[PDB]
Design a protein around this nucleic acid. Structure first.
Ligand SMILES: [Mg+2]
Ligand SMILES: [Mg+2]
Ligand SMILES: [Mg+2]
Ligand SMILES: [Mg+2]
Ligand SMILES: [Mg+2]
Ligand SMILES: [Mg+2]
Ligand SMILES: [Mg+2]
Ligand SMILES: [Mg+2]
Ligand SMILES: [Mg+2]
Ligand SMILES: [Mg+2]
Ligand SMILES: [Mg+2]
Ligand SMILES: [Mg+2]
Ligand SMILES: [Mg+2]
Ligand SMILES: [Mg+2]
Ligand SMILES: [Mg+2]
Ligand SMILES: [Mg+2]
Ligand SMILES: [Zn+2]
Lengths: 69, 91, 99
RNA sequence: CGAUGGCCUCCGUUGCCCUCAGCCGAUCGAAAGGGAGUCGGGUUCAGAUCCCCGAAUCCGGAGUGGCGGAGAUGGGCGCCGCGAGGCGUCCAGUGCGGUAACGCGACCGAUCCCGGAGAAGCCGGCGGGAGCCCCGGGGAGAGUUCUCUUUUCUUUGUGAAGGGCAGGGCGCCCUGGAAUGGGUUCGCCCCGAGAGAGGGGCCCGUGCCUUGGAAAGCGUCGCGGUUCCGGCGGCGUCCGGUGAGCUCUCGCUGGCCCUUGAAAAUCCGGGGGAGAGGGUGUAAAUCUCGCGCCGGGCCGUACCCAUAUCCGCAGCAGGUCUCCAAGGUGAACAGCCUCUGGCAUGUUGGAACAAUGUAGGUAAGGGAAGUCGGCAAGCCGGAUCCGUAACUUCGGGAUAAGGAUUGGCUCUAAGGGCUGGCAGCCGACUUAGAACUGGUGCGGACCAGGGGAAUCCG
């Protein structure tokens, strides 16, 4: 697993051809975006909430999204 | 305090092997375990590694020597005589 | 700092085999604070009776498990152990239910 | 040199010539030696590091290399343009930083040569880190409640692989030059061949945080499928402290040797500098950097592993190599009792309680008179405080011999850490002394040396 700490490289890895699916985990105080690539699983952690759901529509349309309920 | 009155390093042997044998090995054990002065670096760190190996703790130089002492009388006389032969041969 | 706990003996009182009275004075005699069971150790700990809802309030550290232990002692004393059982609905709460 | 294929470009495939050069000897020999790389959760009637789910990782391969990044893009001159910036000539460019230890994401290079790792005994002491045990609390669920008990018991977490930080070690570096010698260990040991004192660097970081990761696991309470369900829900998985404690592991240091305590496969670094790239760009050769693509064939895998799956003719009191190891007492992995786990008394039961047995005990008075012979049994036995002879190879004899004490309960005194001659706050077992007290009993079970004087032999 690899943690992504700045905002934009997460989208950069998300738009790679290798990427399979992104799953959204919504626990208290954190929001985790997990993108599954061939080699690693990249996790981006957002502390607040508003960045999270204004990014939720910024993922590429062709990439599968799964909300963990 | 003085723990033993006339037995030294061979006090570890208890009452075995005989007094004459024990006092014969006493001097050899003392010499073997003694630390000598390294003629190279001047430190007192010339300790015996094995039979005839004398290694310097800090100088990191090892020398071939006697089995129980760093030097041997035969060796020192031989060295002196050979030096004399060397100087006399070429004058 | 406030500590607040509740006891719900509603099922057995509506059934009609025990009443909340003996429960309440059992508490205000046998609650001991710093090991002294007299007069609740002063007004440091307060007891209140609602409709089959026994409320205990305090500020000195208190034990929800203390409360459970006392109600189990009551059940044994008045012979309800094989009928009733004390469980926890949520935090700061206990309630008595059947088997 | 000769021929072929692919846009015959550039390379591959050969066939011949030139040139280059050791083998320690074919080959076999370890399911405990060396040997890259997989962990967690779930699942069966019987299989799981192998199946499923999820996270990884090693090795090998690839015409066009799939891609980024590095090699890399600067300076001079004549210019244009107010400048910004843009033209035309030359020149460089196989990386950069730190005084140094060394650091940075890569940072060309052959035959050859050097070195390292693999690759090392036994014992002692100490320190660090885990697991376990222990103490004080918060929860959740159980047990007792004739009286008492804020009570007793169970449970209360995070993998591999990355990143960061503690914490350990350094025989690593820079400044400076020390006697009134200093630093320092349980012990040692260290220093003008550079100590103390400052400031750095490196290695291991199995610990903590984070990504994994709460989504899963577990403990409880409640609803479902009336079932065939990785069913669905609520809550919780918390805060601390100590220890010459035990086990494992890492590290430092010392002792012993007429004992010095493996080899090879495999891998890596360095010295050299034969070669290759391009003429200023669409830069090239080349990359042990990041990501991406493909594959990993063959054999074993069930179970027993022992008072019933092995060998003794057998379900034979024999024999047969290992890892894990709780609480109390206690020096103790001793003996005795208990918890997790296991078992049904060892190839039969019932009723009687004669003799003689086998295995345990106790005996008045005497105390070896028994017997070949104190055979057997019995006495002593731990610990603390006194005391300890002849002889001696001077080390021993020695726990010599011989004495006194030992319970319970209530106290006193001494022995430490952290924070701000003092004050406050925490604390772990010890040692000594005293009083009181019991039908003189106190190493109360268990554990647990009888002694002395001599002779012979070794
Ligand atoms: Mg072989
Ligand atoms: Mg092998
Ligand atoms: Mg220094
Ligand atoms: Mg959960
Ligand atoms: Mg098996
Ligand atoms: Mg029997
Ligand atoms: Mg039987
Ligand atoms: Mg049997
Ligand atoms: Mg039998
Ligand atoms: Mg008698
Ligand atoms: Mg008698
Ligand atoms: Mg007779
Ligand atoms: Mg006997
Ligand atoms: Mg004697
Ligand atoms: Mg004689
Ligand atoms: Mg003999
Ligand atoms: Zn020297």
């Amino acid at each position: 697993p690899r943690k992504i700490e700045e905002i934009k490289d997460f989208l950069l890895t998300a738009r790679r051809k290798d990427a399979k699916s992104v799953k959204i985990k919504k626990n208290k105080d954190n929001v985790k975006f997990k993108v599954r690539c061939s080699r690693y699983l990249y996790t981006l952690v957002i502390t607040d909430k508003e960045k999270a759901e204004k990014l939720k529509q910024s993922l590429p349309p062709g990439l599968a999204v799964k909300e963990l309920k | 305090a003085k723990r033993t009155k006339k037995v030294g390093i061979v006090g570890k042997y208890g009452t075995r092997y005989g007094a004459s044998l024990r006092k014969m090995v006493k001097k050899i054990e003392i010499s073997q375990h003694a630390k000598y002065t390294c003629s190279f670096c001047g430190k007192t760190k010339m300790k015996r590694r094995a039979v005839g190996i004398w290694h310097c703790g800090s100088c990191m130089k090892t020398v071939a020597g006697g089995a129980w002492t760093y030097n041997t009388t035969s060796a020192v006389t031989v060295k002196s005589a050979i030096r004399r032969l060397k100087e006399l041969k070429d004058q | 700092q406030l500590l607040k706990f509740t006891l719900d003996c509603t099922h057995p009182v509506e059934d009609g085999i025990m009443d909340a009275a003996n429960f309440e004075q059992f508490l205000q005699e046998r609650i001991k604070v710093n090991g002294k069971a007299g007069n609740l150790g002063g007004g440091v700990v307060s007891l209140e009776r609602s409709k089959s809802k026994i409320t205990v309030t305090s500020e000195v550290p208190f034990s929800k498990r203390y409360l459970k232990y006392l109600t189990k002692k009551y059940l044994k004393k008045n012979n309800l152990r094989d009928w009733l059982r004390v469980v926890a609905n949520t935090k700061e709460s206990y309630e008595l239910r059947y088997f």
